[PDB]
Symmetry: C3
Subunit: 63 residues, 3 copies
């Protein structure tokens, strides 16, 4: 149960890293206002984040 929880939380942290990365890009775009390249970056980082949290929930349900 502990190893599981540990596994689930690890994926949760990955998801947070990705949103942070996404927030990072947002900061850059706000200043500006190559936004096109940043908007794409933001979207993919947000993609991985969403996959990451879905895996976290899925595993958590395993506990």
């Amino acid at each position: 149960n502990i190893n599981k929880l540990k596994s689930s939380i690890e994926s949760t942290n990955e998801a947070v890293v990705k949103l942070q990365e996404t927030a990072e890009k947002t900061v850059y775009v706000l200043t500006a206002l190559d936004i096109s390249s940043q908007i794409s970056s933001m979207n993919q980082s947000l993609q991985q984040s969403k996959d990451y949290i879905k895996e976290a929930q899925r595993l958590l349900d395993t506990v």
Copy 2:
């Protein structure tokens, strides 16, 4: 203590999902800036839920 931790993480995850919904709206508004008020309103919606969720996780975590 496990069920508590698990229940704590669940709300954490929900809070994470809500930031993600807020971020996707961000990407949309930033794109647009090139209804925006309705989108911002929407960002506040999911951002409030996110805060409610993590406040839930935090409270639950103290229960362990």
Copy 3:
């Protein structure tokens, strides 16, 4: 290990509070449209550190 997990999840949660704060300031800069942007950077870097620490503490579980 129940202690480390909890301690590690606490940093995760703090990391999330910081992202929400970063998000709030985001809504603020969006409605505005400098210092607010610097503020954003601040709560975001804090988030980065808190998440960094959660991982580290996690690794010892």
